[PDB]
Design a protein around this ligand. Structure first.
Ligand SMILES: Cc1ccc2[nH]c(C(=O)O)cc2c1
Length: 146
């Protein structure tokens, strides 16, 4: 009954049922609502183990994988609360050059991007945002725009 990747779970805090997606790492209280191409933006946070530990922000990326995840979780909280929008955080903080285009990567098909990125991208519906998505490049928040 649920879309690809989506499973039902129990909240450790409240005992209330929630839904999470094991492909996108999305999680929400609400029950969840294949194209050749999708369009996505992302916000990338790199760490010391990233394939290329360097960006326009920081010549030498030193942060730990754990500290990168803390950063990602913080940005997700601010996006979800409405305190900051995705585009503004991507522009300021993404370790990808796409930061200069508010994180926009344009449109792409399967067979183009790192696999965990692609799979998360194609499991989102238009408008939906992922949780933390891990690739060899670092940790991503992905917004599907088309
Ligand atoms: C999957 C994916 C998407 C965008 C990306 N940007 C980068 C970078 O090194 O700037 C890696 C990467 C990987």
């Amino acid at each position: 009954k649920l879309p690809p990747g989506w499973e039902k779970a129990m909240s450790r805090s409240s005992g209330r049922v929630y839904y999470f997606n094991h492909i996108t790492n999305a999680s929400q209280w609400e029950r969840p609502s294949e194209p050749a191409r999708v369009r996505c933006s992302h916000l990338l946070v790199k760490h010391s183990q990233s394939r290329r530990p360097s960006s326009w922000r920081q010549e030498k990326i030193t942060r730990t994988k754990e500290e990168a995840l803390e950063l990602i979780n913080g940005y997700i909280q601010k996006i979800k609360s409405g305190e900051e929008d995705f585009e503004s955080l991507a522009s300021q903080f993404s370790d990808c050059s796409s930061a200069k285009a508010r994180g926009d990567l344009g449109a792409f098909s399967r067979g183009q991007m790192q696999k965990p990125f692609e799979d998360a991208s194609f499991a989102l519906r238009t408008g939906e945002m992922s949780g933390p998505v891990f690739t060899d490049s670092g940790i991503h928040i992905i917004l599907r725009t088309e």
